[model samples]
Target chain A: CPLMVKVLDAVRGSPAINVAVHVFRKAADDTWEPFASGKTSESGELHGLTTEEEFVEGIYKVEIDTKSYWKALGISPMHEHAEVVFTSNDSGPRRYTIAAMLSPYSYSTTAVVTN
Target chain B: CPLMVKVLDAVRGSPAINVAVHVFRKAADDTWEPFASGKTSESGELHGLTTEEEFVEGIYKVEIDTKSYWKALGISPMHEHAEVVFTSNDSGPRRYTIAAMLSPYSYSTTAVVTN
Candidate 1:
């Protein structure tokens, strides 16, 4: 399975570049351990975060460091980190695309699996 | 210095309860470490997140788990986390209040000080 994330500024519907994306896998004790990390490119996407193997069906989380991007525009962002939680169990999509819409004061994200 | 945070749904302009608030301190390497955590009260505010000691005059961040609250309302959250970053340095106010305006699609936060 493959998983990746992309970010966009909702105001202009443009790419949100240079933001950090951290992936975490929840262990049995429920403590989220850092699994992988990447950042948005000039086009404002992290589509390169591919899994080397099939994802283990369980809880996964993606953390987005968003303020750094807005700060580049000379704005102090109110919301800093955005997180998305989803599962990769037996009946889920093999390829997950987590897309997010971001702005200074708000954000929205969703996940879906592709063929 | 004393620091606290409050979260509110910008649309309704009310408190967002049961949301997990995680505080982090940035190290020299720029890795954010989990420092403290608290949650919003019945008032949808986390004014109870008072610091025990004077802040280190460095970078501090707050991560808000807002989706959990929206999930309780039978809604799916698009953005998972909301973060705020600020500093406590030599010339800032003695008491810091980081307040946030949150919504499903947007958010805004700012810091103020009082004597």
Candidate 2:
């Protein structure tokens, strides 16, 4: 179970804006939960996450909020947010893709995969 | 006048999509016009086109119609649209960034810079 992809960049006449995605697995004391959550498609791409059932490899964290999607696109936002860390070894079966690009301010190439 | 940067990806809720950007200068026969046009900000990012004053180097094309921005996010669109090609050499000065990430279906890493 190892597949990932995240891409976001929004802010053009509002568009509602509400994107949240989180996946983590680095236990043994180090904390992180909630293995999968997706949203962002009007062209903000937050694609396919099967992860075999629940990607179980090693270190992995992909989080994106972007300051409440740029305060709902009202602007005046700075930095926003973005995250990406990888290290998976599902034994090899093929199908591991992670890409992130979120915008309300900035967030791109978080955990890019599909190579 | 040589600055290039293009990033787009919209759909999430359809914020009245309408983004267009074009710049070219590879004369001697090759054709391209409408040197500078900007539209995409809610978060789609299409930044700084100072290009000193209309980047005049060689090959440059940045177009994003995306099937009228995914027909205003009504969906049912495929291969919406996305373009990026670069070849600028204003003799060298700095500021030449080209980034793109548009989705309705898919479009990313057209021409990235910031190194």
Candidate 3:
């Protein structure tokens, strides 16, 4: 797999489970087209979003349904949603891992790209 | 002051300096209204974004120009921009500190709220 995601809960100091993540690729006209989607596993990881051939080189966006995740845990959150957008494989083929830390009122997302 | 920000560079493992930060408050009509703006200091921190009396209760968004930060150092980044949006002062007046970690291809942001 070329793309992966890991989500953690900052308040709880644990993995964020069952968070919904949606992936999109920007089109030529600038509209984001849905590409892949998944929910975080027990380990707070989501992998296999796309194969190397399908991932391609382009702009992509990852939207996390953070509000729903906090609501399910009986906490009212601040952000309607948390998102990360970036260009993928721009220079060459690489593996990308997006790590996000979530709190009821805050979130931190970072990416690790490797050859 | 009730709002503050700290930005770090994950690639360099140091503070991100001179990164422009723009803040907005969501209005009743669902549009974002400008609230405040500033740049990070040598310590990777921005203080006095808002006062306790002015922050009030509503949604807020903080936009960080991560691209320019990396570009200034002669590195190309993947994300066009990195932003955080959340509700503030819902339960009561509180202090918010947003901490963001940035790499050329990724970023992680977390928030600490206190009474």
Candidate 4:
């Protein structure tokens, strides 16, 4: 199982705090099929996206609702949406966890396989 | 005189550590004149440019040699030079401070008047 996804305020060295995030899968017709959604915890993190039995192989997207998040902070959002797209196959038979490090103006992501 | 300009690794939320920064004054000929230079401290900041008797009124620029900074970190630089340029008149009778907030891929800056 994918362990958990973590979000960090890479700029402030702090948790991003209560930002909204959504996950979606790409359909054959080039449509986005919603998969899961959640907000960051106090530590700027959320549980892994898929359930134990819900694994699939395809392109998936995780989008941080940065527009709303910045608005919540009383600042204009620099980006429309901070999105990350990756494939399960990249792990090569291992599960992956997505680490999204974000700022008010920029974002970075990484997927690593452990165990 | 302007207060010290501080540099922060906005992405790391920590001191940028040993990064080089250069300051230049905008000459009337549209050329850049070297003013001062320094490196970040353990907290990623530098001392104020200009002496008490060397105050002037014009546009000035501060450039972080980000290419070298990122290279020292074993990563490719996202920016050529993280630069900040502003006018003395922006302070409006008070001194201003240039706060350069940078990341591996992005940067932010602010000019605020103080004493």
lDDT tens per residue, model 4, A32-66 = 89988888789887766577466577778888776
- How much of the true A–B contact set does each candidate keep? 0.14, 0.00, 0.75, 0.16
- Rank list by lDDT: 3, 4, 1, 2
- Looking at model 4, the pairs that clash are A10-B11, A11-B10
For B67-87, candidate 1 gives per-residue lDDT tens digits of 787778886654566666666
lDDT of 3 at B3: 89
Candidate 2, A17-103: lDDT as tens digits: 247767676787888856777776654445565555555567878777667776765765667577777776544554454555445
Write model 3 residue lDDT over B1-115, tens digit each, in one string: 6889999998888999999999999999999999999999999999988787898988888889998898899987878788888777658648888888888766767667777
Reference-based lDDT, each prediction: 0.72, 0.56, 0.86, 0.72
Q: Which run of 10 residues does model 4 chain B get worst, by summed lDDT?
A: B7-16
Rank the models by DockQ, top first. Answer: 3, 1, 4, 2
Q: Is the docking of candidate 3 incorrect, acceptable, medium or high quality?
A: medium
lDDT of 1 by residue, A1-115 (tens): 3777888888777898888999888899989978878988888878766564646677778888877778888877656566666666544446777787876655666566667
3 or 4: which has the higher DockQ?
A: 3
DockQ values of all predictions: 0.15, 0.03, 0.53, 0.10
- Which ranges in model 1 have alpha carbons more than 4 Å from their true place? A9-13, A18-20, A29-42, A51-53, A63-90, A100-115, B9-14, B18-38, B51-53, B65-86, B93-115
Count of backbone collisions within predicted model 4: 2
Task: Give the Cα error of residue A24 in candidate 3, in Å.
Answer: 2.4
Q: Clashes in each model (backbone N, CA, C under 3 Å)?
A: 14, 30, 6, 2
TM-score of every candidate: 0.59, 0.33, 0.80, 0.52
Ranking of candidates on TM-score, top first:
3, 1, 4, 2
